[PDB]
Design a protein around this nucleic acid. Structure first.
Lengths: 151, 49, 188, 68, 106, 170, 48
RNA sequence: GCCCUGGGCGCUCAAGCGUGUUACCUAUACUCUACCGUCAGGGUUGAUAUGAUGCCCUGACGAGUAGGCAGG
RNA sequence: AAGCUCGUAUCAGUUUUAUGUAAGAAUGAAGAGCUUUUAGUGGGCCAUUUUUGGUAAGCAGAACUGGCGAUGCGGGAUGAACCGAACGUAGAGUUAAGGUGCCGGAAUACACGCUCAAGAACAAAAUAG
RNA sequence: GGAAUACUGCCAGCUGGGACUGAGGACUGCGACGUAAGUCAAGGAUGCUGGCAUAAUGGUUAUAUGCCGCCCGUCUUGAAA
């Protein structure tokens, strides 16, 4: 801050790289069902709730259906299906990038997860087999061609 | 101005060709006065001249 | 895709079958060849008995059709190398269909069948006849116990057909129901 | 279907309509197999799960129809 | 669930090579169910991992993995070129490799 | 593929010879450059005029009038062989003139091992009335209600392994 | 003056190849050299 | 015109022959980028925010016997 | 290697017109000349094509330009007379000859006919028009 | 009679997926957005996230794997020998 440079390391030039918001692919829409390809919950079916400012996607299992809590996920490790639920009824304004900062689970986090699950389950049960479908872990089978499967 | 000149030249050439076709005559297109050349063979074994 | 592949040599060209097997098992795919005696070579008997004595009159020479096929396959693989030696360890050739391969499905190679490759009205040679003519002494037993293989396997197929008849009847009686129509709507 | 040799597009279309070629094609098992393959290719993942559940339900009754 | 696979199986054929010169830096990978360049185009950029069992203990498992990426198609039969941080030992010719689905574009 | 090009020239008209004969011929080639080259070669071979002493008046592609109607074409083929030259006549059944000439060239390269350089297409004439065709293999496809099968089909299988033992039926 | 001012163009090999199996033949006989008046533009664009 | 008479393994609607149309592999070959040096030009102080024998910018070039020159 | 002048009108294994050397002609370098001296170099192999001309034959004798002398690299089973291409250290990309059934990386590609036997200059003379 | 389509070429048209590259090092310049303030993809990668001190990683050598490599210097000669 105030210490004069004891060794005149050359300063960096004026970088002309302005930050821009992520342009997510059109297939990714709120309420879409997502399949996790890696991580702790790899292969689980998840619901797309909200887009975060840190290029991650705010998602929920929901936690009650499959145990996946509110967590950040990268769009590149997710497959977007053609089935979308009406997430308009879920308040996602509270969740932000700073919310997931990792500085026994915090009680406030559990309360938020329960609140989200209560709202989401009502819409999930509104259609047949949605609960069972989300409870089923996605997996490949012999003869499956991902370049042909219509997700 | 150059774009206008190019557009007018091409339009005039096409119109002249069409008129010659309609008039029952032959239109001799102006001989090309510019050619580009590209080297296709290597340095080895090239004859002197 | 298949951990082990059983190929029926009958009706296939020796060269095409050897080339395809070499290419397949060079990639680590295990392949088993059966009924090698029924393998066919293009051309009439003459010019097939020839071209064999020509190289014979030169070493050790094997008369069995399986050994002939292995020799054909051997020359299409870079033997004397670890990769070639390892690749040749994934290949098995037998006359007829000795067990336990008789109880498992056997596949064929469309791009190596004589019918699909040889023009109609052209003579072709069979490995069994050539092997017998060049000193093979097991053709009689091979044919005898291959005929027995078809025996009671026809009966097994008849039993399977009868069982599938009942399966189809059970499907039909349950067909046309709400669940059946729902499945048919989704292409199943 | 009947068609004069060298029939033009109009005559060919007229004969095709008269002969009900499209109706015959749909009845053939080949067209049904093509349609089934197209539907299976177009099946969604959720549709695949529904198909699996319905197949399980149908099998539950198919296996009970036999053996008795 | 019966199957836990989330990757397309494939076979390592050989490195890009001439008659007498080979390039170990570039490997050729065959993808199951792929036979045309258009089909292989979907697998471009996907992470490819090679799994083999080790004799000595490691940092918390017994399996060692070499990661790689798909670069471009090869030939006309759907062959695809793959690159790895550490080149394959050349002893895996015909071995099985795992082609993961991420990064996804669907 | 091939195309039909009409090319004309009047050997660079000069004093004492105005409005020359204006040689005309219908050249067949895959591009304008090849058509012009063949036109120059034919003019040199059959006329006392060289490329340096000529001018291409115009070159326009000519498309077949009815690319859907099935027709028969008689061709008066002239070409150079291992010994001298021999005029030849052949009949080809094709929908369009371009396809007919392409098939004629393929046949010449097959049954005579002759190439585009030594082959000259003097004239192609359409034939429509029956009994005007002379070749038997062309009359073969002029019978009423002609029907023939296609036995032993060789439909290809993409996969290297097949469990069906496919049949050649059609 | 303008032609000499421009440095000789350094062109890469064609993106789609030369097409003909053998380059060392006249363009009028299925080659690659000679007069390719109309196709010179395509060749340059492929090389550029 | 062809068929018999005058690299290995291998193949016959060829995986042989002639011609025709597309897909692809590469050499130190060519485009760009990353770095070493040679050459040519240019910038440099009322002194340089590192030896004017210093710090730099630009373009091309880089094979080699005998032999010559230069730096270690 | 060193000195003078000139970067200028100095040239060219290039082309065309005129005389049966000129161009107030095209293109490229402006880097050339004038004097002094200083290492090495006077080994050749082969296609043509000049020709001396040919009869058991052969090439005796040459000779005109060129490939290599000292030359890597890719293809050609290998090769000095073949094809491409001539070289700082690496990456991406595009190609040549050469290939795409395996060895070997790539289409058991597409389309027309040919051949049952090999087929991939010498024993040559006897299925369409 | 009229649509088109087939084919060649143009777009200083739009829109994705894949691979390598991040070179320079406070501002001097050519440009665009905007009435202006200011901003920008405009003479070279910016920001965030993830693993780490019984570290993460890198290094030496034996074998092994896919490919290549006739034994060194001298002289004959136009060559290999």
């Amino acid at each position: 801050p105030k210490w004069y440079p004891s060794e005149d390391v050359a300063a960096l030039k004026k970088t002309r790289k302005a930050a821009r918001p992520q342009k997510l692919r059109a297939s990714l829409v709120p309420g879409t069902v997502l399949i996790l390809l890696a991580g702790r919950f790899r292969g689980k079916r998840v619901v797309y709730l909200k887009h975060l400012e840190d290029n991650t996607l705010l998602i929920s299992g929901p936690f009650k259906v499959n145990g996946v809590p509110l967590r950040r996920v990268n769009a590149r490790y997710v497959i977007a299906t053609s089935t979308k639920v009406s997430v308009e009824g879920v308040n996602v304004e509270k969740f932000n990038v700073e919310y997931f900062a990792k500085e026994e689970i915090k009680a406030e986090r559990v309360e938020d997860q329960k609140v989200v699950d209560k709202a989401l389950i009502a819409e999930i049960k509104k259609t047949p087999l949605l609960k069972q479908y989300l409870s089923a872990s996605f997996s490949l089978k012999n003869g499956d061609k991902p370049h042909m499967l219509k997700f | 101005a150059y774009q206008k000149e190019y557009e007018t030249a091409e339009r005039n050439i096409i119109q002249a060709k069409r008129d010659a076709k309609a008039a029952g005559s032959y239109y001799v297109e102006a001989q090309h006065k510019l050619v580009f050349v590209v080297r296709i063979k290597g340095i080895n074994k090239i004859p002197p001249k | 895709v298949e951990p082990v592949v059983v190929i029926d040599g009958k009706g296939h060209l020796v060269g095409r079958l050897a080339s395809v097997v070499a290419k397949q098992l060079l990639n680590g795919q295990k392949i088993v060849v059966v009924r090698a005696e029924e393998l066919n070579i293009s051309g009439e008997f003459f010019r097939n008995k020839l071209k064999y004595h020509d190289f014979l009159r030169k070493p050790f020479h094997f008369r069995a059709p399986s050994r002939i096929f292995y020799k054909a396959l051997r020359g299409m693989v870079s033997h004397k190398t670890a990769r070639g030696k390892a690749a040749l360890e994934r290949l098995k050739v037998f006359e007829g269909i000795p067990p336990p391969y008789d109880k498992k499905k056997r596949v064929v190679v469309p791009q190596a069948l004589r019918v699909l490759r040889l023009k109609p009205g052209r003579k072709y040679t069979t490995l069994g006849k050539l092997s017998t003519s060049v000193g093979w002494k097991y053709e009689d037993v091979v044919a005898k116990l291959e005929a027995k293989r078809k025996v009671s396997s026809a009966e097994y197929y008849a039993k399977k057909r009868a069982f599938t008849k009942k399966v189809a009847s059970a499907n039909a009686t349950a067909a046309e129901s709400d669940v059946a129509k729902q499945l048919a709507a989704l292409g199943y | 279907f009947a068609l004069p040799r060298g029939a033009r597009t109009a005559t060919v279309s007229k004969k095709w309509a008269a002969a009900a070629v499209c109706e015959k094609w749909a009845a053939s098992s080949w067209a049904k197999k093509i349609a089934q393959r197209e539907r299976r290719a177009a099946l969604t993942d959720f549709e695949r799960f529904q198909v699996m559940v319905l197949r399980k339900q149908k099998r539950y009754t198919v296996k009970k129809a036999l053996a008795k | 669930a019966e199957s836990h696979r989330l990757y397309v199986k494939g076979k390592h054929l050989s490195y890009q090579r001439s008659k007498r010169v080979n390039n170990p830096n570039v490997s050729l990978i065959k993808i199951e169910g792929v036979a045309t360049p258009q089909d292989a185009q979907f697998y471009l950029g996907k992470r490819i991992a090679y799994v083999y069992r080790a004799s000595k203990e490691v940092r918390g498992s017994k399996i060692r993995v070499m990661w790689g990426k798909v670069t471009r198609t090869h030939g006309n039969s759907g062959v695809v070129r793959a690159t790895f941080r550490n080149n394959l030992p050349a002893k895996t010719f015909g071995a099985s490799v795992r082609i993961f689905l991420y990064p996804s574009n669907i | 593929h091939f195309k039909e090009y009409q090319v004309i020239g009047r050997r660079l008209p000069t004093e004492s010879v105005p409005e020359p004969k204006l040689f005309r011929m219908r050249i067949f080639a895959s591009n304008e450059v090849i058509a012009k080259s063949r036109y120059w070669y034919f003019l040199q071979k059959l006329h006392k005029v060289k490329k340096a002493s000529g001018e291409i008046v115009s070159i326009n592609q000519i498309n077949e009038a009815h690319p859907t109607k099935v027709k028969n074409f008689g061709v008066w083929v002239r070409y150079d062989s291992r010994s001298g030259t021999h005029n030849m006549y052949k009949e080809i059944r094709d929908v369009s003139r371009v396809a007919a000439v392409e098939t004629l060239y393929q046949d010449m390269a097959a049954r005579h091992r002759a190439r585009f350089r030594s082959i000259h297409i003097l004239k192609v004439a359409e034939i429509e009335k029956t009994a005007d065709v002379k070749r038997q293999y062309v009359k073969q496809f002029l019978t009423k209600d002609l029907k023939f099968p296609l036995p032993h089909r060789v439909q290809k299988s993409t996969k290297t392994f097949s469990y069906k033992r496919p049949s050649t039926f059609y | 003056q303008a032609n000499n001012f421009l440095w000789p163009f350094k062109l890469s090999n064609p993106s789609g190849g030369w097409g003909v199996p053998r380059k060392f033949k006249h363009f009028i006989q299925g080659g690659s050299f000679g007069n390719r008046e109309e196709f010179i533009n395509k060749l340059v664009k492929s090389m550029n």
